[PDB]
Ligand binder design. Sequence first.
Ligand SMILES: [Mg+2]
Length: 165
Amino acid sequence: NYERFVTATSPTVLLTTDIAARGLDIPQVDLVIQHDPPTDTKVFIHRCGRAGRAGRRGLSVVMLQPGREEGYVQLLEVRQTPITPLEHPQISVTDTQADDVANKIREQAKKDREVFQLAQRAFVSWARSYMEHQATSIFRVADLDWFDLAKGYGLLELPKMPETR
RNA sequence: GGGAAGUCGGCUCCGUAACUUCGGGAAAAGGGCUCUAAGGGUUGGGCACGUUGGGCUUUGGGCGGACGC
Ligand SMILES: [Mg+2]
């Protein structure tokens, strides 16, 4: 899977964990996107650095949720690194017709049987990784809307995980 | 009865109210993070055509040249 990416002649994209997040000189790389905030802060600086290797203009972008994780920006600011809002493109998000794109993955959740427990197990491991976050003042396991996550991950039904609803 | 009035000279257990042991076990509770090794062995890649031979008839030869009379 690695060897097919380095000699790839197509606009490919890799979905990885923190394996490919440190010291990697992969040539002709431009975009890096953070779905999750890092579980530890030093990983962020190495995570952005997988875009702009020796000149070669690189875009680094991290998605965050509304709430106290908007306060994560000044966490970076005081440490050493400034953070600025995005500049281009300025189009923010597409509305609930993108939910009509987002709910599409719940359709193949019905179609394919194997993706069902794949959907659950991915979601709940995400919850386990949340309370391991070192920023106990920024990311809370209480101040998050589980329905918004379930719509985001396209969960068919919430698992029997210990937050009663 | 008096009280030295003699004479120098008498001094742990029962009932009631809270708390406690041994063993195993680090990481949500009782489908659950990152990375670093290892995480039992064996056997397993599709669909057609013209093509190779044996494999289904047909067409022939000799070898057997028999067996018995
Ligand atoms: Mg390096």
